[PDB]
Structure formats: C-alpha cells, structure tokens
Design an enzyme around this catalytic site. Sequence first.
Site, PDB file in Angstrom:
ATOM      1  N   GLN A  17       0.808  -1.214   0.000  1.00 24.32           N
ATOM      2  CA  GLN A  17       0.000   0.000   0.000  1.00 24.32           C
ATOM      3  C   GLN A  17       0.847   1.272   0.000  1.00 24.32           C
ATOM      4  OE1 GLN A  17      -1.699  -1.486   3.864  1.00 24.32           O
ATOM      5  NE2 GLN A  17      -1.626   0.686   4.425  1.00 24.32           N
ATOM      6  N   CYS A  23      -5.171   0.006   3.468  1.00 25.96           N
ATOM      7  CA  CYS A  23      -5.226  -1.431   3.731  1.00 25.96           C
ATOM      8  C   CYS A  23      -6.653  -1.961   3.623  1.00 25.96           C
ATOM      9  CB  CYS A  23      -4.642  -1.764   5.105  1.00 25.96           C
ATOM     10  SG  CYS A  23      -5.304  -0.773   6.443  1.00 25.96           S
ATOM     11  N   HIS A 160      -6.042  -1.957  11.646  1.00 24.92           N
ATOM     12  CA  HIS A 160      -5.446  -2.420  10.397  1.00 24.92           C
ATOM     13  C   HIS A 160      -6.298  -3.480   9.703  1.00 24.92           C
ATOM     14  CE1 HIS A 160      -2.172  -2.643   7.577  1.00 24.92           C
ATOM     15  NE2 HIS A 160      -2.049  -3.947   7.747  1.00 24.92           N
ATOM     16  N   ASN A 180      -1.261  -9.656   4.424  1.00 24.17           N
ATOM     17  CA  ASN A 180      -1.118  -8.237   4.700  1.00 24.17           C
ATOM     18  C   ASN A 180      -0.885  -7.498   3.387  1.00 24.17           C
ATOM     19  OD1 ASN A 180      -0.933  -5.854   6.159  1.00 24.17           O
ATOM     20  ND2 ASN A 180       0.628  -6.619   7.579  1.00 24.17           N
TER      21      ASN A 180
END
Length: 213
Positions: A17, A23, A160, A180
Amino acid sequence: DSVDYRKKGYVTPVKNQGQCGSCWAFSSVGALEGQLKKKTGKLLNLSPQNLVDCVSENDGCGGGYMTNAFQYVQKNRGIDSEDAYPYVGQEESCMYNPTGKAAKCRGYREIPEGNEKALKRAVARVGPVSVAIDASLTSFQFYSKGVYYDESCNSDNLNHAVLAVGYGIQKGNKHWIIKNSWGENWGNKGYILMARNKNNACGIANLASFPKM
C-alpha cells in the site's frame, strides 16, 4: 481440519500500500478476488485505487471499512481491474470506467462479532474473508515466523485491515493465515500466522466480512 486458499488459486500476489492508509481497500479487493476465482474459475488483480478514489463513505488514504467498499461495488455495478485503474498510493478523483469492469458484487455478510467459530466456518465455506486487527504492537510489525500471539494486543483497537486466506495448526498452535498489504518483504513473504482460538487474539473476529457474488 485446515485450508490454505493460496494453494487453490484464490489469492493474488502480496501488494504494498506504500505511504497510504489503504489497507481496507486491499483487504476488500482480496476478498473480491477470492470470490471471483470461486464463482468464475479464474481471478485477476482488482483495483484498490478504484475503491480509494470512489468510496465516499470511506476516507481514502485516511482509512475506511471493507463493508462500505463491498456496498460501493454493489451499487456501482462493478469494480475495475488493477490494470484498468492502477494503484498510485494517493487519493485522486473517481475515474471508474465500466469498460475495465472485472468483478461485481451482490452484497455482503458480516461475521457475528467476536465469534472465531463463525469466522472459521466462513473461511471454510466462502473463501478468503476480510478482517480487521490491532497491528500496532512492535511485535506484530517485526514478525517473521511462527504463530503470532501477544497478550497486550487490543481487541478494541482495530486499526489495520487484512485478509484471512486460511487456517490450520503449526507445531501444536492453531492459527489463521493472514495476507497483509505491506509488501512481500514484510513478515513471512507478506503473510503472518496469527493465533486462533486464543480468546479472539488481536480482535481477529471483531470486524470480519465477505462479499456476495
């Protein structure tokens, strides 16, 4: 009892990102990618930038909710491919174009809050599921291997957005497989194994959802 959707073709390569709090957009497009593979037999990279620029209910690089993204894709009757609407790591005007439409959405479902059993059932029966966690601990950020568990992780601080692409067990410790969006360089090739059935560690099941397709 385990599944790893990476082996099944449901998961695209790990993205980065950059200097943008997007995210939530990568999490959303990840879930949509999984559903695209499941429904059509093939996937491609969908565009987080389209969500960043066009989901007005969210805050672009300042954050957002995955459900708002699914909702947008439904009302907009589509989301562009990455190639048709490339990621630039900053919010710009909405430049959605139907010619580049690569996926659609017919709604979403939220997992019952705090219920890891329901989350497991969702991963097993749906595919990759969008989740939100506390990723603020130093120990989370320098993760490289093993099954992550830190008691000081705050289940009420969901800062997150990431993607659950499976679950299982490693050397006796049950886990979630987590994608992630901090690049392949982070964690274990972009991934982290997070403690499962250890009292909703890091709030893994507190804000989980998936898109209908």
